[PDB]
Write an enzyme that holds these catalytic residues in place. Structure first.
Site, PDB file in Angstrom:
ATOM      1  N   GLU A   1       0.720  -0.944  -0.130  1.00 24.65           N
ATOM      2  CA  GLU A   1      -0.167  -0.199   0.269  1.00 24.65           C
ATOM      3  C   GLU A   1       0.927   1.141  -0.293  1.00 24.65           C
ATOM      4  O   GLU A   1       1.562   1.234   0.503  1.00 24.65           O
ATOM      5  CB  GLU A   1      -1.070   0.439   0.761  1.00 24.65           C
ATOM      6  CG  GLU A   1      -2.298   1.097   1.092  1.00 24.65           C
ATOM      7  CD  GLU A   1      -3.002   1.512  -0.321  1.00 24.65           C
ATOM      8  OE1 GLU A   1      -4.215   0.126  -0.281  1.00 24.65           O
ATOM      9  OE2 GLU A   1      -2.623   1.452  -1.301  1.00 24.65           O
TER      10      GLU A   1
ATOM     11  N   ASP B   1      -2.076  -5.218   0.605  1.00 24.95           N
ATOM     12  CA  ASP B   1      -1.392  -4.252   1.555  1.00 24.95           C
ATOM     13  C   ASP B   1      -0.411  -4.799   1.745  1.00 24.95           C
ATOM     14  O   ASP B   1       1.083  -3.478   2.387  1.00 24.95           O
ATOM     15  CB  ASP B   1      -2.340  -3.540   2.348  1.00 24.95           C
ATOM     16  CG  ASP B   1      -4.060  -3.247   2.203  1.00 24.95           C
ATOM     17  OD1 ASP B   1      -3.760  -2.241   0.893  1.00 24.95           O
ATOM     18  OD2 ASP B   1      -4.548  -3.772   2.570  1.00 24.95           O
TER      19      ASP B   1
ATOM     20  N   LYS C   1     -14.973  -8.756   1.147  1.00 27.83           N
ATOM     21  CA  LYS C   1     -13.614  -8.804   0.745  1.00 27.83           C
ATOM     22  C   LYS C   1     -13.426 -10.518   0.586  1.00 27.83           C
ATOM     23  O   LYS C   1     -12.441 -10.585  -0.184  1.00 27.83           O
ATOM     24  CB  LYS C   1     -12.613  -8.284   1.726  1.00 27.83           C
ATOM     25  CG  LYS C   1     -12.296  -6.401   1.696  1.00 27.83           C
ATOM     26  CD  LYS C   1     -12.324  -5.687   2.343  1.00 27.83           C
ATOM     27  CE  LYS C   1     -11.511  -4.873   1.958  1.00 27.83           C
ATOM     28  NZ  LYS C   1      -9.569  -4.692   1.430  1.00 27.83           N
TER      29      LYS C   1
HETATM   30  C1  LIG Z   1      -6.487   1.203  -5.228  1.00 28.71           C
HETATM   31  C2  LIG Z   1      -6.635  -0.188  -4.382  1.00 28.71           C
HETATM   32  N1  LIG Z   1      -7.116  -0.361  -3.361  1.00 28.71           N
HETATM   33  C3  LIG Z   1      -8.888   0.182  -3.764  1.00 28.71           C
HETATM   34  N2  LIG Z   1      -9.269   1.126  -2.651  1.00 28.71           N
HETATM   35  C4  LIG Z   1      -9.025   1.991  -2.471  1.00 28.71           C
HETATM   36  C5  LIG Z   1      -8.402   3.211  -3.734  1.00 28.71           C
HETATM   37  C6  LIG Z   1      -7.398   4.238  -3.209  1.00 28.71           C
HETATM   38  C7  LIG Z   1      -7.422   5.312  -4.436  1.00 28.71           C
HETATM   39  C8  LIG Z   1      -8.454   5.980  -4.871  1.00 28.71           C
HETATM   40  C9  LIG Z   1      -9.934   4.951  -4.526  1.00 28.71           C
HETATM   41  C10 LIG Z   1      -9.874   3.409  -3.444  1.00 28.71           C
HETATM   42  C11 LIG Z   1     -11.910   3.125  -3.068  1.00 28.71           C
HETATM   43  S1  LIG Z   1     -11.346   3.891  -1.678  1.00 28.71           S
HETATM   44  C12 LIG Z   1     -10.444   3.249  -0.220  1.00 28.71           C
HETATM   45  C13 LIG Z   1     -10.695   3.504   1.097  1.00 28.71           C
HETATM   46  C14 LIG Z   1     -10.028   3.200   1.959  1.00 28.71           C
HETATM   47  C15 LIG Z   1      -8.406   2.370   2.359  1.00 28.71           C
HETATM   48  C16 LIG Z   1      -8.615   2.411   0.689  1.00 28.71           C
HETATM   49  C17 LIG Z   1      -9.367   2.497  -0.831  1.00 28.71           C
HETATM   50  N3  LIG Z   1      -9.312   0.691  -1.240  1.00 28.71           N
HETATM   51  C18 LIG Z   1     -10.587   0.295   0.115  1.00 28.71           C
HETATM   52  C19 LIG Z   1     -10.417  -0.570   1.002  1.00 28.71           C
HETATM   53  C20 LIG Z   1      -8.921  -1.280   1.225  1.00 28.71           C
HETATM   54  O1  LIG Z   1      -8.441  -2.151   2.277  1.00 28.71           O
HETATM   55  C21 LIG Z   1      -7.845  -1.803   0.051  1.00 28.71           C
HETATM   56  O2  LIG Z   1      -6.684  -1.747  -0.134  1.00 28.71           O
HETATM   57  C22 LIG Z   1      -7.918  -0.646  -0.904  1.00 28.71           C
HETATM   58  C23 LIG Z   1      -7.009  -0.604  -2.113  1.00 28.71           C
HETATM   59  O3  LIG Z   1      -5.819  -0.859  -2.474  1.00 28.71           O
HETATM   60  C24 LIG Z   1      -6.767  -1.547  -5.384  1.00 28.71           C
HETATM   61  F1  LIG Z   1      -6.290  -1.860  -4.941  1.00 28.71           F
HETATM   62  F2  LIG Z   1      -8.103  -1.297  -6.085  1.00 28.71           F
HETATM   63  F3  LIG Z   1      -5.495  -1.283  -6.345  1.00 28.71           F
HETATM   64 MG   LIG Z   2      -7.130  -2.397   2.062  1.00 31.15          MG
HETATM   65 MG   LIG Z   3      -4.386  -1.628  -0.637  1.00 36.28          MG
END
Ligand SMILES: C[C@@H](N1CN([C@H]2c3ccccc3CSc3ccccc32)n2ccc(=O)c(O)c2C1=O)C(F)(F)F
Ligand SMILES: [Mg+2]
Ligand SMILES: [Mg+2]
Length: 179
Positions: free
Chosen positions: A64, A92, A118
């Site tokens: 991450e 992550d 998830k």
């Molecule tokens: C991009 C990566 N994302 C998506 N998305 C992410 C994210 C990042 C940037 C823009 C929009 C969003 C959607 S909202 C959100 C809310 C809290 C934390 C992270 C996030 N995730 C949600 C929960 C997680 O646990 C997580 O790991 C991710 C994550 O890693 C991906 F896997 F898709 F490549």
């Molecule tokens: Mg995550």
């Molecule tokens: Mg992530």
């Protein structure tokens, strides 16, 4: 300019604010408008960093907080040197001790429901899932919580402090009702 955008900048440290800004911009979103997502991404980032700090020295590789391409680059190097299968979706962390990718989750709902969503999305039996709630509950794959109890307790304390700090600002209800 929202009350929540200023709270985030005062609540989280500058490195975490910037990585979260860079995360949203990479996917065309703006932290000045999607301010609840801004706050959640920051929260998720800080948990990931405390988590990787919870073990021994070289234990975790942090996936991450990287650009999409470098994140997948590190995943590929990890797979091509551990033999672990390549996850369908970006996780992550990687655990060099237990030899598995970790997907960290922070939710404002019940850990059960969020964990189910998830798991169903990941489908990959391999990737370990670890959910944290803002109320101090957690749920991990195979009931294996990876870190010891003190490191996980610190994470839950911080989550609950974030929750009260939003409350004192009347941002909590709106944050809860956004997820
Ligand atoms: C991009 C990566 N994302 C998506 N998305 C992410 C994210 C990042 C940037 C823009 C929009 C969003 C959607 S909202 C959100 C809310 C809290 C934390 C992270 C996030 N995730 C949600 C929960 C997680 O646990 C997580 O790991 C991710 C994550 O890693 C991906 F896997 F898709 F490549
Ligand atoms: Mg995550
Ligand atoms: Mg992530």
């Amino acid at each position: 300019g929202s009350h929540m955008e200023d709270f985030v900048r005062q609540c989280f440290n500058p490195m975490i604010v910037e990585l979260a800004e860079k995360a949203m911009k990479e996917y065309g979103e703006d932290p000045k408008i999607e301010t609840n997502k801004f706050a959640a991404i920051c929260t998720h980032l800080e948990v990931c960093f405390m988590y990787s700090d919870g073990g021994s020295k070289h234990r975790f590789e942090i996936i991450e907080g990287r650009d999409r391409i470098m994140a997948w680059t590190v995943v590929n190097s990890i797979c091509n040197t551990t033999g672990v299968e390549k996850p369908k979706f970006l996780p992550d962390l990687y655990d060099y001790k237990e030899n598995r990718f970790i997907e960290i989750g922070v939710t404002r709902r019940e850990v059960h429901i969020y964990y189910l969503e998830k798991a169903n999305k990941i489908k990959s039996e391999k990737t370990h899932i670890h959910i944290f709630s803002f109320t101090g509950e957690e749920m991990a794959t195979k009931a294996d919580y990876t870190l010891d109890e003190e490191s996980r307790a610190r994470i839950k304390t911080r989550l609950f402090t974030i929750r009260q700090e939003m409350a004192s600002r009347s941002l909590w209800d709106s944050f809860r009702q956004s997820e």
